[PDB]
């Protein structure tokens, strides 16, 4: 069983692991960082800081996250990512603190690849179909394992010739990100083949629109209990991290999935 | 797929049901009904009648579950089963419109047998260390499975030989009653080993204090995530009906469950 080394924080891979949401949006430091701290106290194994919501700009991001990079570093020990696909914040974040990088974009954006390679920390390889920003209206898809698998495949090439180190890798299928319903419980449903590439898989459904489509819940704060089957199921099919807002929850559930697990068969 | 004739509801197993439970405990009727049909509309699809809390007589139990049968029978068209293990509730309940008997005794009470055989309604036989009202300090096991096997298949026998036929009949494995929590993880784990009995299967852990021992959590209302987990598992080793307190979260929760198995693999 495999475990990241974040900038020195080691997180063991050996049962599925935690990241709460800390999303920094208008002081608002402050609050942040306390919003941190509570989801380490509800169970939290690590905590990805974002300061995207208009698309912000590098200086008004770097604004919000690096105080509460730093502070969150001084004031926890769980691992810190940094929420971003741009180079700049990528350096800075991990100048400040982070021991990992968390990225829709999948490296995509100009220079973020050689920037993230020589940081040197764990980088999560996420899968969506557009750019920041603008995800496609109609997303369409053949075979969408395939092609998020081939995607996949491919950045994960990229980050091998940049200069990464396999221990440094994770993959994300990115769901809700330019998919339907169909797409995202199909890619869940099969979310198992993803781990012939050898990398660790993280998994982010939290109160996302296909879980309110299912069950009819068009408030996104109503769909806990659906968050938690779902990151259930995504557990159990190999991701061994998951996103959640709902620590608390998530941890309680996966406290039952690990004392179940441990009856030998 | 099989399906319960609850006197004549028809209940389909093709999915795992919900079962609400509604207990009727000190106006206490008009509150319990309402509590019924609030649980109908977030989506139970059967009710669970009770009127134990120091155990209650028979006068009382009956003052209290059969104007609350009377009344949810004339207004929902679910089943309403009754929660009793005493022969006499059983024929009032029935005869006032219950189709459903929910025996935590496993119809082992002096006059439980006949009386039940002789409804015609579908009955649950749980399985306890015990008795009704005493239930057991230090429970132990040799073989928690094996000895839940075997006391199953001779309370199958006994009702066989009591008149009932199969359609009529389910299997609980009783988490909780007469169980430390590491018994109950490994009839969890290991439930799928019951389906051979061949009957439908229900589980509850709705709330138990097994579930606060898992995560920490003494109130019994804090323990939503944890039970909804818990339900999926039981109903991905093989329950076909959970019996809950939280509706609508084990609702949403089976809903994702279903759209995750309906992918073809």
Redesign the interface.
């Known amino acids: 069983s495999p475990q990241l080394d974040c900038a020195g924080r080691i997180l063991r891979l050996d049962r599925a692991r935690v990241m709460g949401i800390v999303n920094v949006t208008p002081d608002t430091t402050e609050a942040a960082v306390a919003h941190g701290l509570k989801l380490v106290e509800e169970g939290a194994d690590l905590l990805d800081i974002g300061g995207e919501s208009a698309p912000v700009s590098v200086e008004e991001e770097l604004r919000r996250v690096i105080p509460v990079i730093e502070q969150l570093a001084a004031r926890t020990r769980v691992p810190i990512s940094i929420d971003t696909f741009k180079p700049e914040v990528m350096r800075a974040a991990v100048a400040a603190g982070a021991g990992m990088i968390n990225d829709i974009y999948g490296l995509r954006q100009e220079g973020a690849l050689d920037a993230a390679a020589a940081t040197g920390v764990p980088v999560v390889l996420m899968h969506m179909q557009g750019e920041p920003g603008h995800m496609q209206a109609d997303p369409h898809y053949d075979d969408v394992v395939a092609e998020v698998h081939g995607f996949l495949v491919q950045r994960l090439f990229a980050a091998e010739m940049a200069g990464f180190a396999k221990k440094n890798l994770l993959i994300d299928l990115g769901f809700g990100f330019g998919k339907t319903?169909a797409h995202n419980?199909?890619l869940?449903?099969?979310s198992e083949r993803f781990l012939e590439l050898g990398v660790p898989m993280l998994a982010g459904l939290s109160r996302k629109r296909s879980?309110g489509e299912?069950?009819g819940?068009d408030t996104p704060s109503e769909?806990?209990?659906?968050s938690?089957?779902?990151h259930?199921?995504a557990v159990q099919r190999g991701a061994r991290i998951v996103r959640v807002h709902?620590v608390?929850?998530?941890?309680?559930?996966?406290?039952?999935?690990q004392?179940?697990?441990?009856?030998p068969?």
Do not use: F, H, P
């Open positions: 319903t419980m199909t869940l449903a099969r879980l299912l069950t819940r769909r806990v209990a659906a938690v089957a779902a259930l199921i709902d608390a929850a998530t941890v309680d559930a996966l406290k039952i999935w004392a179940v697990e441990a009856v068969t």
